[PDB]
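## tool: complex_structure
## caller: assistant
## args:
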Amino acid sequence: PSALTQPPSASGSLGQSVTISCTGTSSDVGGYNYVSWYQQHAGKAPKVIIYEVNKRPSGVPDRFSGSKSGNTASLTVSGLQAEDEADYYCSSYEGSDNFVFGTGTKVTVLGQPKANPTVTLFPPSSEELQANKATLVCLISDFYPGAVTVAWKADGSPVKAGVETTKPSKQSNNKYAASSYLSLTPEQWKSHRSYSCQVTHEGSTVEKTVAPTECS
Amino acid sequence: PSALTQPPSASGSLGQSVTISCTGTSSDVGGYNYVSWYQQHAGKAPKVIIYEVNKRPSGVPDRFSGSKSGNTASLTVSGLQAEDEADYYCSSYEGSDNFVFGTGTKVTVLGQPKANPTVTLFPPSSEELQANKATLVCLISDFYPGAVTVAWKADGSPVKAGVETTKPSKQSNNKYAASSYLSLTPEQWKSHRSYSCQVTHEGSTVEKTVAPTECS
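## result:
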């Protein structure tokens, strides 16, 4: 499991009360409770800046509040300070083990204004169909800051089985770019009616769709 | 009190083995038997691969031995599987309901054979030009090492403008994925016999081309 679901990115202004969260596939919470909020810093100490829901460990600033609503378990930084920008993680034990961490909420100090991902889904060219392979490519571009969820739907139904995301870059234009793909062989490509790419940003999902032809 | 110590990088030559130290202090490790090891594939989250010195979670791979010695943990990866490339952490109990982690140990597998990348180039599409935009992307994939150049050719002279390269993201196989994109208008797209993608990988070049033969 990950199950602990986390919002792709967090950006904030210096003074901003950035809340953060976790929500859970299957089940475990309802029994479980007592979850731990982390802070990863750029190739530096991964500190447990919260333990059991809102117990701050000694030395941790009081701003670092933590909460839980029921399935959504929160964090909440009050008055973002510069040195606050980091890769904050989330976690929950299950039973005798089962340390399941959430996906990974990257937080940000706002340099440049907020950018939203232009997503362009590319279908498998004819010549490619000619070679007896098939690859749709989802280009994410012109966004800030570079934490994006990238999910694939085959006719809505989630495909998590031939997918391949890329970690962001920073474009000469000073904004960012990323780009998932999906490898197939033509059968299933031809035998599903549609395929979509969906990317999550700061309060925005985009899902764009693609369907087959056989033009050449 | 500081962070437990690991050697920063390390090395296993798939088939061979590796051993990782998590050196601490009889207040965290030693006295307490309660130090773990977190496996981190490039920040996708860690998989908690060990927690009670040697207690293996069923859903971890059995060749990850983690033993307690003097004042230190010791993670022997046996008979190496090149996937194992990653940074790993150890975490020692102190006692306020506080916990303190390791230096990090970024493992390097040696002797993983060299993959030449699939350049699956894309012309722009139906809905794209419908919008009016012209995005070509070059999906360079499945290569090792991740030293690959991408130059594009315009019609027969080179193109150095309006382009972006995304240099080797870590795949899901210690093979990498690099994207490239050119963006111009239809009344740019059309005015060309072809456009080309070029990948240099090790001492090898791969061109690819697209004529505006628009099946779609």
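## assistant note: Chain A touches chain B through 46 residues (CB under 8 Å). Residues 126-130 of chain A form the longest helix (5 residues). Handing back to user.
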